[PDB]
Design a protein around this ligand. Sequence first.
Ligand SMILES: *[C@@H]1O[C@H](CO)[C@@H](O[C@@H]2O[C@H](CO)[C@@H](O[C@@H]3O[C@H](CO)[C@@H](O)[C@H](O)[C@@H]3O)[C@H](O)[C@H]2NC(C)=O)[C@H](O)[C@H]1NC(C)=O
Lengths: 104, 108
Amino acid sequence: YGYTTDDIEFYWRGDDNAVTGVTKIELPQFSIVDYKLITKKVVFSTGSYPRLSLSFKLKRNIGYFILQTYMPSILITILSWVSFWINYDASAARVALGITTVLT
Amino acid sequence: LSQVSFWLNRESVPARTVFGVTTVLTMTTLSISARNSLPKVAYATAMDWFIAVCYAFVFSALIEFATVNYFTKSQPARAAKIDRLSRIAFPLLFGIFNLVYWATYLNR
Ligand SMILES: *[C@@H]1O[C@H](CO)[C@@H](O[C@@H]2O[C@H](CO)[C@@H](O[C@@H]3O[C@H](CO)[C@@H](O)[C@H](O)[C@@H]3O)[C@H](O)[C@H]2NC(C)=O)[C@H](O)[C@H]1NC(C)=O
């Protein structure tokens, strides 16, 4: 915060092994794909300051969403198709199928 | 409730359609709520399997109605036979599934 590059320097101790425990992290909705260590300098009106950056790549797991939103939608669409086999003279049944599926 | 509709008269197309549609939509609502009960795990739970099988049974009941209706006034003995056989093949199969399911999971 207060010390510029004339007062303080930052570096990763190990420079690639400085961060441990990334492979031992279990997220319920995500998977860590990659992590990166960066060493740079930033500039504000008050001077230039050292900065380190630790970044993670997170890929989302889609199983929960297969079970939550996709499969109900596929099933409601197939339910909608069920009406094509009812005879076309039956109006109330086909209207019930169509209206229920559309509004759902 | 979805199997109750096997005892209705097949001339009552709107009624059995109401049965099938309402039961499958109720199963969808129940599945959504139950999957909203617990955290967002990417795998399926035992309750998810029970719900999927119950949904399959309900949808199969609706499909049986569709088949019966497709075979009415074109081959009536066949639709009568299908209704009569379903009236005993659905509840027995669901009882057997419940037995196997609870035996598998309540032993663990
Ligand atoms: C996540 O996002 C960050 C932020 O963009 C990514 O960090 C970026 O990484 C690249 C390559 O590692 C950096 O570019 C490099 O810059 C150096 C500067 O000396 C240059 O010599 C190299 O040739 C290369 O161009 C980039 O600076 C860096 N971004 C920032 C803002 O510093 C990161 O890669 C992303 N992914 C992961 C898994 O972290």
